[PDB]
Structure formats: structure tokens, C-alpha cells
Amino acid sequence: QLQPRRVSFRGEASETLQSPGYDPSRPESFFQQSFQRLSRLGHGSYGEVFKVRSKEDGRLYAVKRSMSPFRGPKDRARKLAEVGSHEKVGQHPCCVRLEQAWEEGGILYLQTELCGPSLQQHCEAWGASLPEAQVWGYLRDTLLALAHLHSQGLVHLDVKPANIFLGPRGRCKLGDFGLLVELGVQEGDPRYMAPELLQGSYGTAADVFSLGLTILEVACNMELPHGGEGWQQLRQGYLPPEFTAGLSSELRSVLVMMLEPDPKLRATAEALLALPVLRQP
């Protein structure tokens, strides 16, 4: 049945879980026994995310645990795929690192490096548009992450402020690889979706469009529509002046390149990173 087991598709480590604080003969879960919980960072239909201290190394991590036991084999496969997707991405300074994953009692656990607040949370705390200085840094870092994915034929499919995490000295990292697809499935948040996805045209360009709207929202403190005329206008090269009049011409120009409705004409992440405005500061 459902005995505690490491989850890894590159199958390097032993399937057997061990830790200081853990004895499999006691009834508590590996998660209960092997970590000190400090706070709940978030929750939703998926389950919960905890800030923890590891008993193995004494360091801080985030652990995401699913809500309820697997519904069956297709549910199990869909959830375990997040681990596979993380492994396909591989280590990169602008991508959230997976430390380990395991299953027990039909629950999946993913232990990632502890980052700062999501970009969404950061903008909520700020309570206003972010300064452009901050925005350029976060755009560059998220572009670096997308360049890494796209070079491997991977599409994130759900780029948004909630899935980008701050770090020290004005850096950020892309996370939440649950919807990632390997070119050659599930839908991302409709507020950020590329217009070509309506015709089933999946490609790396879709993430560039999503990041364009992400940056628009954070730079302008603008709530994005989930449908209607406003949703269509943002996919027809329109920028509302009531929100966007304050942008520098340089930042506006980069956003227009990323929000290009035709994916064949839209800028690539590598092309954007070569522009003098987006080069290492």
C-alpha cells in the first residue's frame, strides 16, 4: 500500500527515508517527525505550504503538502509530475530549487529552498506601483529563468506574480512548476494567458506574454481582467492610459515587445536579455 518513499525520476537517491528525529516504528509521519513547523506560508485547494526547520541540517525550507490522499492513479501521476518537471528544469540561480520530495499515506510532499514573499505578496505590502528600479531587476531575473526553461524546450504555462519569489538584494526566482509542459495539458490563470493558446498554439512565446502582463500589473498596480472587453483589449496591443501613463518610455517599449499578439513576432527571452537596458546592472 502507501509506505513512505522518496519520489525522484532521475532515481539517484535511495527510496528509503531517513532523518535525525525519525523512527519508522513510531506512528507519526516522516513530515511530523523530521521537521519543526514554524508557520503556514499559504494554503489553497492544492493543500498547504509550511515554513519549516529541517532536523537533518538545522536549516529553513518550505514544504508543500497535498490536501488529501490521491484520488486514484491519474491524480497520483498528475501530482508526481510536478517533481518530474522540477527535475527537468534543473538547478538555476533564478529558479526555485527542489531539495527533496516524498510520498506517504497518499500525500505528496515537496521540500524547496525557502524564498522570500511572492511578488504578489510584495506588491500587496507595498500598497502601490513598484518603483521602476525594482521592476527592471525582477524582469531580468524572470527572463533569465524563462531563457533557461525555453532552451530546454519547456513552457511554464503559469507565469504570474504569485509564482515568483523574492530573494535578498532585489533578486527573484520563478517557481511552481506544476503546469510545465515539454514541447513535442492543464490551463494557467486566465488573467495572464497568451492569446494564441485559444487556438491550441503552445510554445515558449506564451510565457513571454504572461510575463509581460505580470510586469504590467506590478509596475502599474493594475488588476487584470479575467474576461470581457478589457481581456480582449490587452491582447490587441492596447495599454490603458489611466494605469500606464507613468511608465518610462524604455519600460513601455519592452512591454510592447512582450505583449505582441502574434507569437511569431513576439520577442524571445534571449533577445530581450541582449538589450542594453536589461544587461547585468
Side-chain angles (χ1 to χ4, degrees), residues 3-168 170-184 187-279 281:
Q3 82 288 346
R5 191 185 73 88
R6 184 181 313 288
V7 174
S8 179
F9 291 87
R10 284 166 177 73
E12 295 179 351
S14 169
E15 275 191 346
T16 293
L17 300 176
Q18 285 178 18
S19 174
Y22 177 59
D23 181 341
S25 78
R26 298 189 298 248
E28 287 77 27
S29 73
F30 179 81
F31 182 52
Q32 196 286 336
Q33 297 197 50
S34 309
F35 301 86
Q36 180 178 39
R37 289 143 289 286
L38 304 175
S39 70
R40 186 165 73 163
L41 296 170
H43 66 100
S45 304
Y46 63 89
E48 299 169 292
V49 185
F50 296 92
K51 178 178 147 164
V52 310
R53 192 170 297 282
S54 165
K55 295 183 189 178
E56 173 68 47
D57 66 17
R59 307 203 55 88
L60 301 175
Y61 296 91
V63 172
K64 181 167 64 67
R65 86 165 169 210
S66 59
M67 186 72 90
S68 76
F70 304 126
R71 297 181 84 246
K74 299 187 178 301
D75 183 54
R76 176 165 179 275
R78 177 186 67 73
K79 289 170 167 165
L80 262 32
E82 185 172 2
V83 178
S85 288
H86 247 291
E87 293 183 324
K88 294 180 187 180
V89 170
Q91 295 211 13
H92 184 277
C94 297
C95 290
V96 176
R97 187 175 64 81
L98 184 59
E99 170 73 21
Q100 68 177 338
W102 66 97
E103 64 181 319
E104 182 170 10
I107 306 296
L108 182 67
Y109 301 80
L110 269 72
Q111 176 187 346
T112 57
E113 67 182 317
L114 182 68
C115 297
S118 79
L119 188 54
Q120 187 186 8
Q121 288 179 305
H122 178 66
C123 291
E124 290 168 345
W126 196 258
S129 300
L130 298 183
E132 290 200 11
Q134 290 186 27
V135 176
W136 288 115
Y138 300 146
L139 174 55
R140 170 177 165 78
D141 284 351
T142 307
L143 285 169
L144 286 165
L146 290 186
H148 178 67
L149 270 59
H150 292 170
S151 75
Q152 293 178 284
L154 310 179
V155 189
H156 185 282
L157 284 177
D158 201 19
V159 182
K160 58 178 173 171
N163 296 339
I164 293 161
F165 303 89
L166 279 51
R171 305 300 298 284
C172 66
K173 300 178 191 269
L174 181 61
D176 286 344
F177 302 114
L179 269 53
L180 182 144
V181 298
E182 175 171 14
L183 294 176
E187 297 179 289
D189 185 314
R191 294 176 291 156
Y192 308 85
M193 66 171 269
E196 68 274 13
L197 293 187
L198 293 171
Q199 290 86 46
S201 304
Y202 298 92
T204 60
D207 291 333
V208 178
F209 188 92
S210 296
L211 183 56
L213 290 178
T214 293
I215 299 300
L216 182 67
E217 171 174 355
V218 306
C220 300
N221 199 31
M222 192 183 73
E223 176 180 305
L224 310 175
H226 41 83
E229 191 173 27
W231 186 101
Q232 305 289 345
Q233 287 171 339
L234 293 173
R235 289 157 180 83
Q236 297 168 334
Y238 180 71
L239 291 171
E242 33 284 295
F243 286 97
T244 68
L247 295 164
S248 65
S249 299
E250 295 80 9
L251 182 52
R252 182 182 272 262
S253 290
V254 172
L255 292 176
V256 168
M257 293 168 198
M258 299 175 75
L259 293 169
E260 170 52 48
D262 186 338
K264 298 188 197 291
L265 304 181
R266 192 177 302 141
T268 69
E270 282 184 13
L272 293 161
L273 287 165
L275 293 170
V277 294
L278 276 164
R279 286 192 314 207

